[PDB]
Design a protein around this ligand. Structure first.
Ligand SMILES: OC[C@H]1O[C@@H](O[C@H]2[C@H](O)[C@@H](O)[C@H](O)O[C@@H]2CO)[C@H](O)[C@@H](O)[C@@H]1O
Ligand SMILES: OC[C@H]1O[C@@H](O[C@H]2[C@H](O)[C@@H](O)[C@H](O)O[C@@H]2CO)[C@H](O)[C@@H](O)[C@@H]1O
Length: 179
């Protein structure tokens, strides 16, 4: 039993009353789906390669929609707290459970990401990925910021939170701000 969030009656994995999410890490160098780089380029701002930023699964990214540019949840922040769980063979238990806040700056589309991001409804609709989570957070790791957490695809509980001031200021230069 490596996954510590138990599926509820509707199949949604939860932990101590809180919804769980799966996580992965990614690198791709793109500006991303929230326009966090200079307009018209595919060049991210350095902070969007360096900071705690995420590409959530598509249906959360766009609050039930399929838009992959300026999704409704661009610029939102989520606090992710490890449970100690992970998907067997696809992660491991992290050294600590310190929570980390990530800002949504990109999208993990269903297309090409079935296992983790193939979720056919937004959180609250009891649709889950292949591992039983209502949402997935793909974590930017360009500069090893996820390695520095020693997170190997940890299971987490997730919540939306106000963004820290530095991340809020960063987001103000993304093209999707006030879209
Ligand atoms: O599709 C989401 C995301 O997956 C990343 O690969 C995972 C892989 O699926 C998993 O089996 C392994 O244990 O962990 C890696 C890294 O988290 C992939 O690197 C991403 O490009 C992709 O967006
Ligand atoms: O990079 C700008 C470009 O981002 C597109 O989103 C991609 C993103 O680049 C990539 O990092 C991620 O893996 O997949 C998403 C969605 O496919 C966005 O859709 C474009 O409109 C935008 O021009």
């Amino acid at each position: 039993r490596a996954q510590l969030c138990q599926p509820d009656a509707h199949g949604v994995r939860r932990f101590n009353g809180r919804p769980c999410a799966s996580t992965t890490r990614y690198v791709d160098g793109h500006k991303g789906a929230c326009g966090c780089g200079q307009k018209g380029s595919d060049t991210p701002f350095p902070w969007n390669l360096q900071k705690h930023v995420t590409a959530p699964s598509e249906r959360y990214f766009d609050d039930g929609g399929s838009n992959l540019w300026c999704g409704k949840n661009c610029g939102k922040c989520v606090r992710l707290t490890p449970t100690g769980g992970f998907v067997p063979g696809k992660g491991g238990a992290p050294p600590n459970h310190n929570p980390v806040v990530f800002m949504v700056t990109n999208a993990c589309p269903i297309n090409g990401n079935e296992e983790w991001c193939g979720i056919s409804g937004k959180p609250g609709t009891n649709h889950v990925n292949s591992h039983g989570y209502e949402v997935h957070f793909d974590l930017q790791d360009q500069v090893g910021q996820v390695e520095a957490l020693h997170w190997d695809n940890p299971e987490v509980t997730w919540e939306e939170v106000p963004c820290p001031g530095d991340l809020q200021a960063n987001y103000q230069q993304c093209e999707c701000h006030n879209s």
